[PDB]
Design a protein around this ligand. Structure first.
Ligand SMILES: [Ca+2]
Ligand SMILES: [Ca+2]
Ligand SMILES: [Ca+2]
Ligand SMILES: [Ca+2]
Length: 687
C-alpha cells in the first residue's frame, strides 16, 4: 500500500486529524448514559457526562458528516475505564467525562461503549480510510488524598479488574509520595503530583510492565496513533524506553505528546524532547502564533513567518509536528462577536502548512467558549454548509494528493504585515498559498515569483474566501494581481516524480531489527537499497517496496544519529533523511544515582558512558544536567536514562559549567543493565 494508505500508521503528514471530546460529540446510544448526579440532562453543569459515545462517532462517519470534510484521522478521548465516582470540587459536582481519571487501563470506559463498540469504531474508521488516535495518560490515575482514603476512589489502579493498589495503602510503591508540584521547575513537575492526581512511579517494574501490556492491548485492536498526555511531567528516559518498546513491538505507530508552551515562549527542553525522545510533539509555538496573528491581532504576518523559520531550524522532524489552532485546554478560536474569516484563514494556513494538522471538534461550526469547561460544549450542529466545513473539504485532501503539502519545504514568497504568501515544494510538485487578513483593504501583488510552471491556475477554494486565478509566466513569474480584502487562495501543481525522493521516515528512532517506513515519490516498483548511513540494506532486509513507500529492517550498525537514503534498482540515489537515531538494542530505564558530588553555583553533574545512549564519552553528548532535589537530595544527584537492555555499561560522571569541564577521577563504574523493565544504580563520586 502507498504512503497515503490508511494502513500507514507510523507517518501522518498526509493526514488531517479531527479531535473529538467523546462525551461532547454525539450520543448514539442512550442506554450507556451515566445516571444520577453523574449526568447533566439539560447540559447546565459542563463537568458532568453529557452522553457522547463511540456509537455516535460511528454514526457520523457512516452518514458522512466526518467523511465529507476530508478528515483522515480521529483523535478521541482516552478510551480506558475511569473512576465512576462524582467528586465535589468547591461546591460543583465533577465527573471523569474527559477520560483522564483512569482506574483500569485494560478495560473500557462504559459510558463511551464496551470493547465491541470500540472494535466497531476502529472497523468503521479504517473501512472509511480514517485512522484512529487515542489519548493516553500514563502519568497518573485519578484524584486521591493519601491521608483521607474516602475521597474519590483513592486513585486506585486495577488490572483487568484486580486491584494492584491505591494511593493510601501503597506497599508496592506504585505511586510517588512526594507531595504536589508548584510547577517551579521541570524536575519538580515530574516526580510530584499534578494537583491531586496520584502520580505513577514508572521506576517500578510492575508499573513499566503494566503500561507496556496495556498499550499493546489497544494497539492490538488496531489503534493507529497515540497522543501522550502530560509528557512534560514524566521522565524523558522512561518515555524514550516506552516508545522504543512500541517501535520494536508488533504495532509501530505514530506517537506525539503535549508539552504546553505559552505565547511567545520557546523552551530548550521542549526542543530536546521533540528531537531526542523518539516521540513527536503538538506544535504549541505554531498554535500560539497563529492565534496571535488571526484571532487576537497581537502579531503580524511578518511575526508569523519568523516563527515558521525558527521552528524549522530548531526541530529535526518538522513534518511530524502536530499543528492546531485551539484544543480542549485553550479558549475556542471563534470569539463571540468577531467574524468567521479569522477561523477560515487560520484553517487554510494550517491545512496547507508543514506537519500534521489537527482540528478541534466544532471549529467548523464556529463554536465559542472561553476556558475549560466552556470550550467543551456539546457539538452545536452538523451543518455541512458552513464556509469553514467547505474550506476543510477543499484543502484537507490536498495532503493526500500533493506531496509538496505533505512533505515539501516552506518558502516565503511575499510578506507584509497583513499578507503572507508561502510556497511548498517537493521535487516537481508545488503549492502557493496567499492570505490577506486585512478585512477592509485589498492589496496589489506585483513581481511575485513561484516554482509553478507557466500557465493559468485556478484557486483550489474556487473563490470561497474571495480568492482569484493567477497567470504564471516564464520564470515562475506571477502576473500582477489583486488579493482581495480577507482574501485567501491556493494554487497548486503536481507532477509524477522521476527521481527518488524521501518525504518522511517513521519512526524516527529504532534498534536493529525494527521495521521502519520510508515515504516519498519515485522509488520504483522493484526493490533497491536502503542506506542507513554508509551501510546497505538489500534483499532480506527490505520488507516491501513500491513507488511511494518502502518498509525495511534497521541493520546492525553503529548506534547514533545517521542519515537514511535509498537507491533504486536502477542505481539512482535519493536525498537523505537527516538524524535517524539508531539505538544499541531494546531499551530499559535505569535510574543512575551519584553521591557526594558537590558543585559551586552554575556547575552541574552529567553522565557519560560507552553506549551511544550514554553519549560515547563525549561530554558534548553527556546526559543531563542531572537532578538533585526530589528523588534524592544534593550532594546526591539522580537521572532516569533510557539505556540498552542486558548490557555492561562503563560510565563516569562529570561536572560542567561556564567553560570548565571537570572529570571524575579513578577508574570507571560498571553496571549490567536489566534484560527488561527498569533498574537503578547508586555510585560514589570519585575525586
Ligand atoms: Ca451515550
Ligand atoms: Ca460515507
Ligand atoms: Ca509524573
Ligand atoms: Ca505578543
Amino acid at each position: 500500500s502507498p504512503d497515503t494508505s490508511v494502513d500507514n500508521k507510523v507517518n501522518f503528514s498526509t493526514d488531517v486529524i479531527y479531535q473529538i471530546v467523546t462525551d461532547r460529540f454525539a450520543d448514539g446510544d442512550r442506554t450507556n448514559n451515566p445516571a444520577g448526579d453523574a449526568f447533566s440532562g439539560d447540559r447546565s453543569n459542563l463537568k458532568l457526562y453529557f452522553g457522547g459515545d463511540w456509537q455516535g462517532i460511528i454514526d457520523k462517519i457512516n452518514d458522512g458528516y466526518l467523511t465529507g470534510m476530508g478528515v483522515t484521522a480521529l483523535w478521541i478521548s482516552q478510551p480506558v475505564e475511569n473512576i465512576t465516582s462524582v467528586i465535589k470540587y468547591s461546591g460543583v459536582n465533577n465527573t471523569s467525562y474527559h477520560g483522564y481519571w483512569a482506574r483500569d487501563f485494560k478495560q473500557t470506559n462504559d459510558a463511551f461503549g464496551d470493547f465491541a463498540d470500540f472494535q466497531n469504531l476502529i472497523d468503521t474508521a479504517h473501512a472509511h480510510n480514517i485512522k484512529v488516535v487515542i489519548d493516553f495518560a500514563p502519568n497518573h490515575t485519578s484524584p486521591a488524598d493519601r491521608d483521607n482514603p474516602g475521597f474519590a476512589e483513592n486513585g486506585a489502579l486495577y488490572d483487568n479488574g484486580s486491584l494492584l493498589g491505591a494511593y493510601s495503602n501503597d506497599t508496592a510503591g506504585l505511586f510517588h509520595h512526594n507531595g504536589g508540584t508548584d510547577f517551579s521547575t521541570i524536575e519538580d513537575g515530574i516526580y510530584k503530583n499534578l494537583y491531586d492526581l496520584a502520580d505513577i512511579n514508572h521506576n517500578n517494574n510492575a508499573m513499566d510492565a503494566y503500561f507496556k501490556s496495556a498499550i499493546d492491548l489497544w494497539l492490538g485492536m488496531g489503534v493507529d496513533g497515540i497522543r501522550f498526555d502530560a509528557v512534560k511531567h514524566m521522565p524523558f528516559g522512561w518515555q524514550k524506553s516506552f516508545v522504543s518498546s512500541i517501535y520494536g513491538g508488533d504495532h509501530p505507530v505514530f506517537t506525539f505528546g503535549e508539552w504546553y508552551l505559552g505565547a511567545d515562549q520557546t523552551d530548550g527542553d521542549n526542543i530536546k524532547f521533540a528531537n531526542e525522545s523518539g516521540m513527536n510533539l503538538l506544535d504549541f509555538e505554531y498554535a500560539q502564533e497563529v492565534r496571535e496573528v488571526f484571532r487576537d491581532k497581537t502579531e503580524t504576518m511578518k511575526d508569523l513567518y519568523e516563527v515558521l523559520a525558527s521552528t524549522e531550524s530548531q526541530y529535526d522532524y518538522i513534518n511530524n509536528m502536530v499543528t492546531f489552532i485551539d484544543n480542549h485546554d485553550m479558549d475556542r478560536f471563534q470569539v463571540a462577536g468577531s467574524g468567521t474569516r479569522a477561523t477560515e484563514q487560520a484553517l487554510a494556513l494550517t491545512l496547507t502548512s508543514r506537519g500534521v494538522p489537527a482540528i478541534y471538534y466544532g471549529t467548523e461550526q464556529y463554536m465559542t467558549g472561553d476556558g475549560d469547561p466552556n470550550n467543551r460544549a456539546m457539538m452545536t450542529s452538523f451543518n455541512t454548509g458552513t464556509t469553514a466545513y467547505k474550506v476543510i473539504q477543499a484543502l484537507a485532501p490536498l495532503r493526500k494528493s500533493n506531496p509538496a503539502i505533505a512533505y515539501g519545504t516552506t518558502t516565503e514568497r511575499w510578506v507584509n504585515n497583513d499578507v503572507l504568501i508561502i510556497e511548498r515544494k517537493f521535487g516537481s510538485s508545488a503549492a502557493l498559498v496567499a492570505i490577506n487578513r486585512n478585512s477592509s483593504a485589498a492589496y496589489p501583488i506585483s513581481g511575485l515569483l513561484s516554482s509553478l510552471p507557466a500557465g493559468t491556475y485556478s484557486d483550489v477554494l474556487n473563490g470561497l474566501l474571495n480568492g482569484n486565478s493567477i497567470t504564471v509566466g516564464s520564470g515562475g513569474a506571477v502576473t500582477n494581481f489583486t488579493l482581495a480584502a480577507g482574501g485567501t487562495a491556493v494554487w497548486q501543481y503536481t507532477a509524477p516524480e522521476t527521481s527518488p525522493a524521501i518525504g518522511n521516515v517513521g519512526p524516527t528512532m529504532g534498534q536493529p531489527g525494527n521495521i521502519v517506513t520510508i515515504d516519498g515519490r519515485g522509488f520504483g516498483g522493484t526493490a533497491g537499497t536502503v542506506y542507513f548511513g554508509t551501510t546497505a540494506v538489500t534483499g532480506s532486509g527490505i520488507v516491501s517496496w513500491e513507488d511511494t513507500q518502502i518498509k525495511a529492517v534497521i541493520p546492525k550498525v553503529a548506534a547514533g544519529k545517521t542519515g537514511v537514503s535509498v537507491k533504486t534498482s536502477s542505481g539512482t540515489a535519493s536525498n537523505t533523511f537527516k538524524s535517524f537515531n539508531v539505538l544499541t538494542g531494546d531499551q530499559v530505564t535505569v535510574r543512575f544515582l551519584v553521591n557526594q558530588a558537590n558543585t559551586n553555583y552554575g556547575t552541574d553533574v552529567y553522565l557519560v558512558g560507552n553506549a551511544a545512549e550514554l553519549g560515547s564519552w563525549d561530554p558534548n553528548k553527556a546526559i543531563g544536567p542531572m537532578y538533585n532535589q526530589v528523588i534524592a537530595k544534593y550532594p546526591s544527584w539522580y537521572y532516569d536514562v533510557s539505556v540498552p537492555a542486558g548490557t555492561k555499561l562503563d560510565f563516569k560522571f562529570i561536572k560542567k559549567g561556564g567553560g570548565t569541564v571537570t572529570w571524575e577521577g579513578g577508574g570507571n563504574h560498571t553496571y549490567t543493565t536489566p534484560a527488561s523493565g527498569v533498574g537503578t544504580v547508586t555510585v560514589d563520586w570519585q575525586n
